[PDB]
């Protein structure tokens, strides 16, 4: 499994593979548990809000993270990710698996989805 083949999977499958430590070939670092719990508490905090309100609040952290990556069209990429992925899994890529997230964003830039 390469980084690009992995970034091509849904966030929930990338994260599922991370936790099932048969990781003899998974280009993912060991997640920090204080970070994993802060992200899960954050997502817990959004349960019960309007879908629209949940994507805006997560989008805030997500857009800031894509702008660090150096990619143009980070709003459009941010919206597309929020509409195409599991919110909780995406936040785990954002805070814990940033390089996979970047490989996934390059896949979308390749589809002209930032334009």
């Amino acid at each position: 499994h390469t980084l690009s083949t992995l970034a091509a999977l849904p966030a929930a499958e990338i994260v599922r593979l991370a936790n099932s430590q048969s990781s003899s070939g998974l280009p993912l670092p060991k997640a920090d548990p204080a970070t994993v719990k802060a992200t899960d508490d954050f997502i817990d905090s959004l349960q019960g809000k309007a879908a629209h309100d949940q994507k805006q609040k997560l989008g805030d952290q997500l857009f800031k993270k894509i702008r660090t990556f150096g990619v143009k069209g980070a709003p459009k990429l941010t919206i597309h990710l929020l509409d195409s992925e599991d919110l909780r899994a995406l936040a785990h890529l954002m805070n814990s698996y940033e390089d996979v997230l970047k490989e996934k964003v390059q896949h979308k830039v390749a589809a002209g989805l930032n334009k």
Binding site: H52, K55, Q56, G59, D60, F63, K64, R67, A74, P75, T78, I79, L82
Partner: peptide, 6 residues
Amino acid sequence: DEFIYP
């Protein structure tokens, strides 16, 4: 730059 969900 401001991020907003439509």
